[model samples]
Target: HHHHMRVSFMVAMDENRVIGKDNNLPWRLPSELQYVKKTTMGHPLIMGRKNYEAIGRPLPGRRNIIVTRNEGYHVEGCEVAHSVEEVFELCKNEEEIFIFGGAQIYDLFLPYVDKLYITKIHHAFEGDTFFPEMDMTNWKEVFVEKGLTDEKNPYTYYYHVYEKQQ
Candidate 1:
């Protein structure tokens, strides 16, 4: 039987796949937050412990699943799972599961995901974390919205959607 859930991620990346520095985003754009909320609202969001700790609280209006090896650690409004497989089990009945992540979680789940919603930032930053470089040979861009950040915003970026080639 099919697992009955689709795995996906919504992320922002630089030209070199840089995602974050020092446990937080490199830029702050209101539009990016709004886009993430709009896309992930009402869905279950799975993230690594580091990502969850970085946020410091449960994101309102969604089920938060945190992947960690720390047993007995707990956060209000969030469920803790020891591994990606456990996270998958928790979300098996979900229509769509969003892997909102730190770099390691993204790497662990990349091969299992069917779609990706990526925001491509035009500017680069020195970062300690990064998204794994994806193999595009089996992935295809399915949607794109190209735009520059507003003059008042801190960074310029574009959004693109990719789907795995069957």
Candidate 2:
């Protein structure tokens, strides 16, 4: 078997895999945002071209790598790679890399990712973007932090970690 390079992401999703709409997250969970910052800080982050555009800039203190099909595309302060192989080459030496995404990017890279740091929001949403469905047969839940949202919040959510079953 080809030992694919390890890839991962920390993201929040609803039951329908909904992630965002209009280039912004549907919910405002400060704690989860903090969790993302804490985890991805100082690490290399890989994302699709559109995902990068949505964010509008490189996240501070991390190497932002964008995967795009557009030839000669460039973003200030980030490296653009045309394909997954190019991303692998750019990140091969790193201990870990995070694939922060849009729907298409996640779908394209899901098979190669070794782990998932998922925040499961306990509600459905009307959205235009989504995460790919997780196949239970191929993945095992390794960790979970279940909790109710504060009364001031709109919904409850949990953080879950899943690892690929080898």
Candidate 3:
């Protein structure tokens, strides 16, 4: 069984740690969407009910796992989980498991994930939600790419990959 799974993060945020506003992502980078899609295509992704509802549909090419407090809540294309530990078991046969976020879910699993697939938007925006403050001392930057200022998205940013130290 190829059940050796890796817990990882696939996220994007602005300078103020603000990730979303009005229950949606703060940025609108088309390239960033493609990057995340390609990166987690064949694997499983875990997110909270809030994120799932915000998305409104199952992401194509990935196994969607939605964690919720209400066990009765369900979706046609997702597997419902009551806790993060339950998510691990559901994805136990997968090669990689992505922790998609809406704040609480990210904070809950941040200490457990090893890799960070991050898009650091260079500018700041007025927002209501944020990514949690992380101790940068424990993470090593492994890759960085300057994001382009394109028509699809107004902000300049950087695509980054980080690995948590063992």
Positional deviation of 148 in candidate 2, in angstroms? 7.2
Cα RMSDs of all predictions? 1.5, 2.0, 2.2
Residue-wise C-alpha lDDT for candidate 3, range 39-147, written one tens digit per residue: 8898888988899999999998889999899968989988999987788779878777999997999988876878898889988888998888878787899999987
Put down candidate 1 lDDT per residue, 71-127, tens digits, no spaces. Answer: 998988888899877887898789998999889999888878888999998887888
**Colliding residue pairs in candidate 3:** none
**TM-score versus the correct structure, for each prediction:** 0.94, 0.90, 0.94
Candidate 1 wrong stretches, greater than 4 Å:
none
Better of 2 and 3 by TM-score: 3
Residue 76 of model 3 has an lDDT of 95
Model 1 RMSD, rounded to 1 decimal? 1.5
lDDT of 2 by residue, 49-78 (tens): 888887899999999999889898987899
Per-prediction backbone clash count: 0, 0, 0
lDDT scores of the candidates, listed in order: 0.86, 0.83, 0.86
RMSD of 3: 2.2
